[PDB]
Each structure stands twice: as structure tokens, then as C-alpha cells.
């Protein structure tokens, strides 16, 4: 075969502007309904935290600094607050086409942290192969902007949403769904104005007899003062001649509830969330196989995003950090897993009761989200550690 791709990539970097990036920033920061849904999306994908595994981790045991560590132990010290970083980067990579950042060192040149950069300030510059070669940054500053170019050699970036498996630049969900977002905001604004005009009755006093003597603006000022709603108490009564009519503009009915429900059905579906995330219910869908389907669809979407993020974080952040600031092998089988947000421990407990006889104690500890037992034989064995203890004590 070949060592360079021979099919072409339908693009060159020489797709989107800093204005498109700042539009995403404006949708994000302005809050309300749209921002809250996209925050719920980030929380589902990345809010349940993470765990680091290395295959054959026990064999990695090495004296790092007058003390033994495995590679997993070293990584857990290299990234102490990885749960927060995963939620930040994972959030940014759903809003923007990418999350992006630096590697940083202590003054002594030992590793400090992976530092995220403000993603709306940065755009990639890519070659004819479609690979990112530089990053162009524009930032606000006193009296205008600063601008700079950075080589791709010491930044890293992560892409959840892609045009294709070859796309190194990614897609913003916000820019893709810009039409549905504006359609939602327009209808929400239309309802808000329509409620003020038409949601409340208004008093219409008509003065004078039909085909009688006309009444004029100076006369109506005197009438207005009598009937002024600002002054009117709840149980005010009125006394008039026959030639005064106290009419009402009724609150003219329109189904703003159904319009909100339609807007939310469009927006949630466009953002891939179930309608329930938008505080809106639907008939029949809350039960049985209809529920099980939409919840399976949500969980599958979460797994796809998590798996996509995990790979790129390990490959673009962790492995370079191990290679450049660590005594361990950077080609080791590191995995970052991100937890299932919707896992019911009660269902796992039922499973452990039903089929525990077929599971090693370490598999049970792993499913149950606990540290594995201290003794490798009890960890590796199938019957319960409590059952082995009572036997050890009895015999």
C-alpha cells in the first residue's frame, strides 16, 4: 500500500471566522433556554467524572522519586483534577468545533498542567492533507486586538463533532443548528410580546351616544381621570348616564403553551437531547419500549462522544506528557474512561445477586465502582470475599 493518503480531502485552510467563533461565545454566555440545554448536554457527556486504566499497570512499578509508582499512579498525580478538566474541555468541544490548549511546565521544567485556551480566540491553519500546522489567535486588548500565529507543535486540540473521520478541524453544533436556534429565539420573543398585548384584558371606555354629540380629547382627559386603572381598587363600582359604555378588550386566546412545546420539540431534537430535558412532556412516550428506546438513543450518543474524547485526550495530551516528563513507557496501553451518567446502581446490585457466582471479585468491585481487594487471590476468585473469610475462620 502507501505511507501517505492517496485520496483527497475536499478542503484547504487557506472554514469559519473569528466572528463565527464569537457568535458561539455570544450564544453561550447570554444564558436562558438555549444555553441551559447545551449545558445539560455537557453535564450528561462529561459531568459524571473519569477513571484512568493502564493494561498491565502492575508491571510498570518503578521508583520515580525515592518511592514506587505505577504509570496509573503517576498519571493520577500528573492530572489531579481530571474530572474538572474533562468537563471543561468536553463542554468546549460540544459548543465550539474543538477544545484547544497548551502543555505547561513548572519553573524547574517538570510538568505543571494541560492549560485550556479560550476557544473562540483561536482558529486552526491546515495543509493540503487537511492536518493542522499552525493556530491563528485574535484577542481583544486595549484599543483593539492582539493577533499572533502559534506553531501546532506545542498546542493540542480535541474534536468531538466531525464532518468525516478525516476532519481534523470539526463542526460547531451551534453553527450547524444556527437556524433552529434563531427560530426558537424568534418564537420565544413573539410569545413574550403577544402575552403582554393579548394575555391580559384591557378596559375600553366609549363615551357619547352613537350618532349623538361628539366628545373631544380635552373631554376624554376628564373621563380618563375618573376611570384611571392605576387609581382603581378591586371592588370599585361605577355609576353613569346611558351614554357611557365600559367595554373590554378580552384576553384573546392563543395556544402559547402549544407553541412553546413545538419550539422545545424542535430545539431539543436538533441538539439531540430528549424532549424531557427541556421541561416538556409528551403522551405515551414516558413508558415501556417507547421510553427504553429514547433512553438507549441518549446513552448511545453519550458513549460515542465519550469514546471520541477519551482517545484524543490520551493520544494528544497524556502520551506526550508521559513521553516528555515521565520515566515510564509512553507506548503503554493507557485508557481514560468517562463514567455513565444514567447508570442505576440498584440494577447493578440486582445483577450482582443474580449472577455473582460467575463473576470474579475484581469484576464485581469494578462494576460496583469500588477498589479491588488487597489480596490478588481473593480479587481473582469467583465466590465472595465474605464467603472466603467465614471459611478461613471456620477451617
Amino acid at each position: 500500500a502507501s505511507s501517505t493518503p492517496q485520496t483527497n480531502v475536499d478542503s484547504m485552510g487557506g472554514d469559519l471566522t473569528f466572528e463565527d467563533l464569537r457568535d458561539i461565545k455570544d450564544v453561550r454566555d447570554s444564558g436562558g433556554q438555549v444555553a441551559q440545554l447545551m449545558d445539560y448536554k455537557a453535564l450528561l457527556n462529561f459531568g459524571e467524572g473519569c477513571e484512568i486504566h493502564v493494561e498491565g499497570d502492575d508491571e510498570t512499578k518503578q521508583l520515580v522519586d525515592g518511592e514506587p509508582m505505577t504509570l496509573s499512579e503517576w498519571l493520577e498525580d500528573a492530572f489531579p483534577h481530571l474530572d474538572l478538566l474533562v468537563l471543561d474541555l468536553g463542554g468546549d468541544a460540544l459548543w465550539y468545533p474543538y477544545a484547544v490548549g497548551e502543555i505547561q511546565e513548572t519553573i524547574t521544567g517538570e510538568f505543571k498542567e494541560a492549560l485550556p485556551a479560550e476557544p473562540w480566540t483561536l482558529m486552526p491553519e491546515s495543509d493540503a492533507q487537511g492536518k493542522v500546522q499552525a493556530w491563528h489567535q485574535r484577542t481583544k486588548t486595549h484599543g483593539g486586538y492582539q493577533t499572533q500565529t502559534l506553531p501546532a507543535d506545542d498546542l493540542w486540540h480535541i474534536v468531538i463533532n466531525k464532518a468525516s473521520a478525516r476532519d481534523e478541524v470539526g463542526i460547531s453544533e451551534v453553527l450547524r443548528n444556527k437556524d433552529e436556534i434563531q427560530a426558537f429565539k424568534q418564537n420565544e420573543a413573539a410569545i413574550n410580546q403577544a402575552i403582554e398585548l393579548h394575555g391580559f384584558p384591557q378596559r375600553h371606555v366609549k363615551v357619547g351616544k352613537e350618532d349623538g354629540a361628539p366628545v373631544r380629547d380635552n373631554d376624554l382627559r376628564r373621563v380618563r381621570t375618573i376611570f384611571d386603572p392605576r387609581t382603581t381598587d378591586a371592588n370599585t363600582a361605577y355609576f353613569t348616564g346611558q351614554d357611557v359604555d365600559v367595554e373590554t378588550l378580552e384576553a384573546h386566546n392563543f395556544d402559547y403553551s402549544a407553541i412553546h412545546e413545538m419550539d422545545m420539540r424542535n430545539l431539543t431534537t436538533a441538539l439531540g437531547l430528549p424532549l424531557e430535558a427541556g421541561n416538556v412532556g409528551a403522551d405515551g412516550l414516558g413508558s415501556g419500549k417507547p421510553a427504553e428506546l429514547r433512553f438507549a438513543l441518549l446513552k448511545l450518543a453519550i458513549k460515542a462522544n465519550q469514546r471520541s474524547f477519551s482517545v484524543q485526550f490520551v493520544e494528544r495530551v497524556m502520551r506526550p506528557v508521559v513521553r516528555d516528563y515521565s520515566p515510564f513507557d509512553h507506548e503503554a496501553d493507557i485508557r481514560l474512561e468517562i463514567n455513565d451518567p444514567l447508570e442505576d446502581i440498584g440494577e447493578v446490585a440486582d445483577l450482582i445477586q443474580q449472577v455473582g457466582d460467575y463473576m470474579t471479585n475484581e469484576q464485581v468491585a469494578e462494576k460496583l465502582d469500588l477498589p479491588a481487594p488487597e489480596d490478588d487471590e481473593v480479587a481473582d476468585s469467583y465466590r465472595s470475599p465474605a464467603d472466603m473469610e467465614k471459611d478461613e475462620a471456620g477451617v
Binding site: 484599543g143 483593539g144 486586538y145 493577533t147
Partner: protein
């Protein structure tokens, strides 16, 4: 990058516009005035201008200054002689001297350009009522003021 160059020019030009609108209001609509009558134009003028504002029971904290006024102020023996000033900072570092931002009770110096005030010569702009300068009889060369007003 000529789009970078031009974004810089356009930003600079709009900022220069804010600067002109600010300085023209500031110079034209100040209610007090210290007239130096071509004499004692350094620290004594600056103190006397603080005195005018103090007499109306406001407290100024900032001053905006023309290049000619700055030139005169740094020739003032009260600032130029390290003896009289308490440091040689003005003699050495001129406008960058910490004393220049901490004089007569004021705690900010806002050094401005000669071209900023609206003299009415640029097209579209229609001039202010004063002359920004410190060259000739009736020029306004500095404004002493409360930043928050």
C-alpha cells in the same frame, strides 16, 4: 496580513474618535478656569486649578495635558531640580517619572496628543469653542478634573 493591518487601523481610528469626543467635551464644558496670564505656568498653575475646583467643593483627581504644557511643566524648577522636587525622577525619566502621576493631590496623569482636540479642520468634524495648546494667549493646555464626573 493586510486585513490585520486594516483591523488595527480601523480600531485605532475609532479610538482616536472617542479620544476627540472626550477631549472636546472636557476642554469646552469645564465650568472653572485658572488663567495663568503667561506666568507661573508649572506646579503653581496646576495647584491653582485644583484650588478653583476645591472652591466649588468638588475634589479633582486627574489631569489631561497638551504636549506644550508638559514641556513647560518639566522645565519648572520645582520639578526639574531634584532638590526642590524631592527626587531626580522628572529630570531623568520626564513624563514616566512617578511624580508626574502624583502631583497637587491628583493621582492620574492622562497625557494627550496635540491633534486630538476638534479644531474643526478635519472634514465631518465641526470644531469646539476653545483652542487646545499651550503656545499663545487663551490656549487651554491642561484640564484638572474629577475622573468620575
Amino acid at each position: 496580513d493586510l486585513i490585520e493591518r486594516n483591523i488595527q487601523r480601523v480600531g485605532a481610528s475609532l479610538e482616536n474618535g472617542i479620544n476627540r469626543v472626550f477631549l472636546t467635551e472636557l476642554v469646552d464644558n469645564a465650568q472653572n478656569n485658572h488663567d495663568t496670564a503667561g506666568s507661573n505656568q508649572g506646579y503653581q498653575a496646576l495647584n491653582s486649578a485644583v484650588g478653583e475646583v476645591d472652591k466649588d467643593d468638588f475634589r479633582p483627581d486627574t489631569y489631561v495635558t497638551h504636549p506644550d504644557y508638559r514641556t513647560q511643566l518639566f522645565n519648572d524648577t520645582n520639578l526639574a531640580y531634584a532638590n526642590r522636587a524631592g527626587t531626580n525622577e522628572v529630570l531623568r525619566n520626564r513624563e514616566d517619572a512617578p511624580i508626574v502621576g502624583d502631583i497637587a493631590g491628583l493621582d492620574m496623569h492622562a497625557a494627550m496628543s496635540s491633534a486630538t482636540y476638534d479644531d474643526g479642520t478635519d472634514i465631518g468634524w465641526s470644531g469646539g469653542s476653545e483652542t487646545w495648546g499651550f503656545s499663545s494667549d487663551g490656549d487651554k493646555g491642561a484640564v484638572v478634573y474629577d475622573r468620575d464626573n
